[PDB]
Design a protein around this ligand. Structure first.
Ligand code: CL
Ligand code: CL
Lengths: 948, 930
């Protein structure tokens, strides 16, 4: 068969679809570089000492059609139950128009963070809608653009609360009826910080122990609705901030955290039409009082002005605070769950306040009806008040029998304690479902009541003093797009403002903006993956178990690590998990004093943030004068701190894009002094099939599946950051269910499980040969671009035949010295050529880092190079005094259509020179939606963006 | 029951009717207020004549939520079985590239616009269509190709009609090879009957040509897979001045010498194999190619290259035929398959299929079976118990083709793997251990068609077929074309007579479920139970809506519906021994497809006058009915009229026709004014067609035929087209028993989600919105043809002729100027020359309606400025529209108006601007709207 099929005319190959440059184009590019074969270039680019000497051991590549069919048979092994398990995840109905035109639209999911706000106004507006929706619902004044999941959001509230206090308190109170995974995430975050987590009963908590904060669940995990006002008042007189983890759908009916006096509200917006996803992805919310706005973690959309005085949005950063409490108040998050926040905000837009309230009201009414019927069947109910969740006492002999009978109908209930079961209803629930529940509990299909007769007993089952009266979602945007046609057009208008991968290459250094192929994306929205509750019984998730087993083995082979955790749900979470595992390792050997983390001064700012969150003390390691890592400063500090040494965090190849052939020795050094080596996987697209982190001395790494392995960038999302570890660290990995484990890094055991299918598909379609070729072509394209631009812009940090790896760093500092042109000028001017800028001013201030990836055609690479060459000449005209140095296209970019068409034109250049500076713009023109937005040095944590 | 009563108590759930309707309750009351009515019911009572008002609720299932309707259809779909069908017969499983599926077929930017009437804002799909034509031209080796036809059978029937019109032969006979696909032969006979054409079905091997023919149709490769050299046959046909058509598989043409090189005059075929779902019959784009010497009588639409006002390249869409559409969406998909794969990719797909087929053949031979095709491409004719072979195949989820006793056919395709090959061998062997090893057979593998038919000529050598092979490049190319086109995701397209309403996501979703999209139209009945349920339900529901006793879902275009309906009437009169009844009465304001359909049916058209108020002249009708009483076949009517009027005389009109022995056919163009409010059968129509792509939400596809089912009274039921391959059936109207079956799920979903209450409300709101627009515009443009109580129905006709008198402004000036405001024009110059007919539908919001009215009002003021000498009568925005960005930005500006006045004439254009891709590009008797 195999040898028979090899004889047949070639079939459609996914590798060819994924690679931008074909064979012909590759030969052209090699010729400009001066190499006969790609193999020759790669032999010079990669140091023999670390070159992986064999083929990756992975399943042979399949066609798109074949991979889909294989994954379909795997998916068919999952069972889609009606899960009434609750615990922070509830089935919901994604309006088809949103599923098709957002979730299944590359126009919405292919861009990354809105670094270049002028060409991201569409998704920034949807995020602003998300924030408004969260503010209205929570009754709190400030809301960010979303966080990873509910549990991590709660941990961010804990950190903020510690930073605000001025007392001797080191305890944080967590109610024992918070969701259990939330408590686990908080404990895991508290451990390296030395924070005492007190898990207790809010009813009886004495406040005899000083706390800086308290977390309460609203409604509680068992469904109970409580009035938290007196707790909140007592907490305040003890100087603690109170955070409510509050179900946002419930807030359409219940008095909100703001009005109860709470200081912070967090929760999941999953119920706003986001698939269960077997854990994710879902956007969590975070809201607080205006007095704490400067301490807000993560990203937040603000309203600014453009150069024409018109309103424009930008994605702001947490302002950098200097204070004695920074060591426990640090956050490492630079992203938002953008795509999912867009989806949740659009759910609110489509339903309106009345539609949302009606959804909640119907859930409540069905829940009340369920309760009445259960009582008529002589079960006991334990919640005095509730929204959507009942706590049913059944008799400790009968509980497993009830759960098994429910399963017999394709229904999951929540096993509470023996003699008790929980039931959470949701938007999908019908009267037919209600009848199934009754019959299950009755043990027969004939009931001693008729469903309709029970209606007279139905009434609001939460107290009057918690019955919300205040309004929400009153702004026009939530009232005017309720027909499918109007929402369709609203989505299209927003999408059209944004430059995504369906327009042009976005060559973001360190971000790997490669192809997010349709076949990879398709299975995400199969219900067998999308409609599974994360806490469903193992018997119903055999397909996911297979998916996990295979992905773990494959990523393990690519990295060379012995074990993989698929849990961490962001790049930053991967770093954090990796450091946590290292910390736990030293603890397991009785060495609680190894807390020094060596970090190269060129590192992305999330690295030391993550280290600080792990209770580590960062020690900077210096760079060369040739831009490589300085071994002697490393050694000097590896000695000075030698018996305190916990870790070295390194990126390979370097953040400067260098294949440092000294990598194995650096590792050999750290080990000599007792430390472990962690590799940041940002630059892993230069490695796949060419070298393996475990082989050169790394003990743990994380991978960015949303970079190297095709999960889309989501308009700014966290993606997934699984970690690989060697055998000696295996015992410490995050738990895969609800023991030397560090605990839980993400709320869900497999993080955002549903998007893992994308990376599975990529590997299945590429195979060993495909994955390796992709790496080699990415290196080819970077070197090609470097070679084309080297006479215009100095290329920094070369080899080794003076080659680069997968990215090239352009030095724009001469343009400032010669023409007073700033890197931001070049970035906006690129928009007029139809391009999103590459990475700006990181790792080197005043430069650009360009990463084309392997997915972009020679034609597209040449156009970008031609744009940069055109911009060089514009700068020359300034330098030579041929144009006004203050009034020129570079200073005035981006140019909107209106600015060129309306009003008086007083520029020493033509409207044509402004809008059509290259031939291709006259065939297809992308219009910047707004002029340059108001407001050099990089943020200290989110290093690729401007300081706040 | 008790659950229903309990459910009604609960807080309201998301209602599909609310999503479908543009105006909400608040907007509706605001519109009723401007009209002078307190309730919608008061308006409708005055709009619909009480004598024809349907007096009860439609009897249809209560509405379901989007979520619930999807779940119900899913349980129906799960009753279908997706087999590996190697049946062939003109349908072959194929791989739709996922990037094309997601970004074209499941993209409203591609499927929501209609025909490119306004070419300046349709350059995207026009270019994709140009690509389709180039692809067909290259593959067939013939010079002129149209933008596609409905299906293979009807395209072959169009070829017959072309041949009849241009052949110099005095013969009246058309030869059809007996090894053409069986359904093709049926469609040809059905089209030939009313024309008096003799169809000769025979063996092309032995046909003597002593019998004179004007045309011949040959299948390449043949239906049983045999590949023949038709050169000698073609030469003899030419000796007799007959035209030869080859029905040629376009994939096979990557390997086989093409029709153009064999001497053929016309080539037709299906492009379904170019990545289009089986669809249980459709929709698929058929191709039609021919020579320049025959060009003038070729059917359908053809994209041409022209120039715009700036001298830049621009596209436009240039034995009678009634076809005005092309299968646009599917032609786009077929051409993008060609663009994605390129010449090499296509040839490799074909070559692998052939190699697999030769391998299959060698293996079957080792197993002592007889192989009957000397030469073949993808299809084997296998001689033996054939029933036991077929049954054994079914046991592995495989369908083979039952030929004659002792013979089975096997057609391989793009999805076939060596594992599938192994399966076929084991079936025929009778065990899993074969007396050979798969790899061992490779040595005997050789090209199994002759050198004399081995293609050497190249194809798809243009750059477009060579530059978009990565997924990223294709995604971007698709995005750029899409971006040029104005579709329903941009703004309302209020085309009178086209009903541009919401094509809801939930309705579209099931089209691409494998259980609907991946079923072969000739799969065994036991595998298609879900479709059987779908058809039964749809037939019952459409019958209740129309009042008819029986529905045929077969006709696969609006024009096919008219044609089918008239064929049924013709057959009725034949059944009564009254062939002399061939007079078709048609109002003079009718769409041109109506008389063309009648002529195709062998009928003689007699026009009927409109009166001084633009209603059917009852006296004239009565006089003509009486005059042609002895010969009266039919009256064709639209209701409400083509002038948009609910005539109170419709029942009287039907009575007069019946009194003189005619039947009444109703064109369903205006059914969006009727649903729930009146029923064609109830007022006297004997048959009608419905346009499912207008009234019932099938997308307009960028110009597609949609589906045109007919409803008939019991006395016509015997004559309906057959639903499977003595009876009184007219035969076959479409190639597939249920036409484009996969898209029928869209109308099922709409009816399931709307319910009887929703369907009726939709109609009422459509009438409300048209009346609202007329009231807003009446002071600026005279409203023509108001009905009783001075109300219109679902559309209003704006008189633009005063603008011509006062300002020398033409309707085309206004149509292009609307582009600068971000709107696609309404229907231009039909049914009344120099006017516009606007149909908003119920799906557009009050905000959108007001913007369109405001644009028309602003344009009225621009005309006034010309009239009053405030601006140059020749150099003004109306004459220079549409304005491209480049024209406003590049070169010298010498107009007396500003660039801002050109590009931003309304405030909304400063919030969102749609840019016309080209400047202005430099009445048809059939396709009347163009
Ligand atoms: Cl491989
Ligand atoms: Cl209803």
């Amino acid at each position: 068969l195999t040898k028979l099929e090899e004889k047949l005319a070639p079939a459609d190959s996914f590798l060819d679809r994924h690679l931008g440059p074909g064979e012909t184009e590759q030969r052209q590019m090699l010729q400009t570089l001066g190499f006969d074969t790609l193999g020759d270039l790669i032999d010079q680019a990669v140091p023999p000492a670390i070159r992986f000497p064999r083929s990756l051991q992975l399943p042979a590549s399949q066609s798109e059609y074949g991979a889909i069919a294989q994954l379909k048979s795997i998916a068919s092994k999952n069972q889609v139950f009606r899960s009434y398990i609750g615990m922070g995840y509830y089935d919901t109905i994604t309006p088809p128009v949103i599923q098709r035109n957002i979730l299944e639209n590359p126009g919405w999911y292919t861009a990354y963070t809105p670094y270049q706000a002028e060409i991201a106004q569409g998704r920034l507006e949807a995020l602003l809608n998300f924030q408004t929706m969260v503010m209205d619902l929570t009754g709190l004044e400030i809301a960010n653009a979303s966080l990873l999941d509910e549990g991590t959001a709660a941990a961010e509230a804990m950190a903020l609360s510690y930073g605000v206090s001025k007392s001797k308190a080191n305890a944080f109170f967590v109610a024992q009826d918070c969701h259990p995974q939330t408590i686990e995430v908080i404990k895991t975050r508290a451990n390296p910080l030395g924070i005492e987590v007190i898990v207790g009963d809010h009813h009886t908590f004495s406040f005899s122990t000083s706390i800086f904060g308290a977390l309460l669940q609203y409604p509680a995990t068992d469904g109970a609705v409580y009035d938290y006002r007196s707790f909140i008042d007592k907490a305040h007189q003890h100087q603690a901030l109170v955070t409510l983890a509050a179900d946002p759908l419930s807030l359409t009916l219940l008095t909100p955290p703001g009005e109860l006096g709470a200081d912070i509200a967090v929760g999941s917006t999953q119920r706003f039409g986001i698939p269960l996803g077997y854990g994710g992805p879902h956007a969590a919310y975070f809201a607080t009082k205006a007095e704490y706005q400067r301490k807000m973690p993560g990203r937040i959309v603000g309203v600014s002005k453009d150069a024409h005085g018109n309103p424009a949005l930008r994605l702001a950063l947490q302002t950098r605070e200097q204070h004695i409490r920074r060591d426990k108040a640090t956050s490492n998050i630079c992203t938002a769950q953008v795509l999912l926040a867009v989806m949740a905000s659009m759910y609110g837009v489509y339903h309106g306040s009345t539609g949302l309230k009606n959804i909640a009201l119907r859930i409540h009414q069905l829940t009340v009806l369920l309760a009445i019927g259960l009582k008529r069947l002589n079960y006991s109910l334990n919640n005095d008040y509730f929204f959507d969740t009942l706590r049913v006492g059944v008799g400790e002999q009968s509980a497993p029998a009830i759960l098994k009978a429910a399963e017999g109908r394709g229904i999951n209930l929540r096993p509470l304690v023996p003699g008790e079961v929980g039931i959470s209803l949701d938007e999908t629930v019908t009267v037919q479902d209600l009848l199934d529940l009754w019959q299950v509990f009755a043990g027969k299909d004939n009931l001693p009541f008729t469903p309709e007769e029970l209606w007279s007993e139905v009434k609001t089952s939460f107290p009057a003093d918690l019955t919300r009266q205040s309004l929400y979602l009153q702004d026009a945007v939530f009232n005017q797009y309720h027909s499918e046609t109007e929402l369709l057009r609203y989505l299209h208008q927003l999408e059209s403002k944004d430059l995504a991968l369906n327009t042009s290459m976005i060559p973001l250094g360190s971000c790997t903006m490669k192809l997010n192929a349709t076949a990879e994306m398709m299975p995400v929205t199969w219900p067998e993956f999308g409609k599974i509750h994360p806490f469903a019984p193992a018997g119903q998730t055999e397909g996911y178990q297979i998916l996990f087993a295979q992905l773990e083995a494959w990523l393990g082979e690519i990295t060379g690590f012995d074990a993989i955790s698929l849990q961490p749900n962001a790049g930053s979470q991967g770093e954090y998990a990796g450091l946590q595992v290292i910390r736990q390792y030293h603890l397991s050997r009785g060495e609680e004093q190894r807390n020094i983390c060596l970090i190269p001064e060129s590192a992305h700012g999330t690295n030391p943030a993550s280290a600080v969150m792990c209770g580590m003390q960062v020690v900077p390691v210096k760079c060369d004068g040739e831009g490589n890592i300085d071994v002697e400063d490393l050694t000097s500090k590896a000695e000075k701190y030698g018996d305190r040494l916990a870790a070295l965090m390194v990126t390979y190849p370097s953040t400067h894009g260098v294949f440092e052939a000294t990598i194995g020795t650096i590792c050999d050094i750290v080990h000599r002094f007792g430390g472990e080596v962690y590799m940041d996987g940002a630059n892993m697209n230069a490695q796949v099939g060419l070298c393996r982190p475990a082989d050169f001395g790394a003990d743990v790494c994380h991978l960015n599946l949303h970079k190297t392995f095709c999960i889309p960038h989501g308009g700014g999302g966290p993606g997934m950051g699984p970690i690989g570890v060697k055998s000696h660290l295996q015992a410490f990995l995050p738990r895969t269910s609800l023991d030397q484990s560090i605990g839980m890094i993400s709320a869900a055991p497999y993080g955002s499980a549903s998007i893992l299918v994308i990376s599975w598909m990529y590997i299945a379609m590429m195979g060993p040969q495909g994955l390796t070729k992709a790496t080699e072509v990415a290196i080819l394209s970077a070197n090609y671009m470097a070679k084309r631009l080297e006479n215009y812009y100095p290329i920094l940090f070369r080899g080794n035949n003076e080659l680069v790896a997968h990215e090239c760093i352009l030095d724009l500092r001469p343009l400032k010295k010669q023409a007073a042109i700033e890197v931001e000028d070049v970035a906006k001017r690129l928009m007029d050529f139809g391009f999103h800028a590459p990475t700006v001013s990181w790792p080197v201030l005043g430069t650009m880092m360009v990463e084309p990836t392997e997915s972009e055609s020679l034609g597209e690479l040449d156009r970008f190079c031609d744009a940069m060459i055109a911009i060089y000449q514009e700068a020359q005209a300034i330098t030579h005094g041929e144009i006004d140095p203050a009034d020129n296209p570079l200073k005035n970019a981006p140019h909107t259509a209106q600015s060129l068409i309306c009003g008086e034109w007083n520029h020493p250049y033509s409207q044509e020179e402004a809008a059509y500076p290259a031939p291709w713009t006259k065939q297809f023109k992308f219009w910047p939606a707004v002029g340059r937005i108001n407001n050099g040095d990089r943020h200290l944590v989110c290093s690729c963006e401007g300081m706040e």
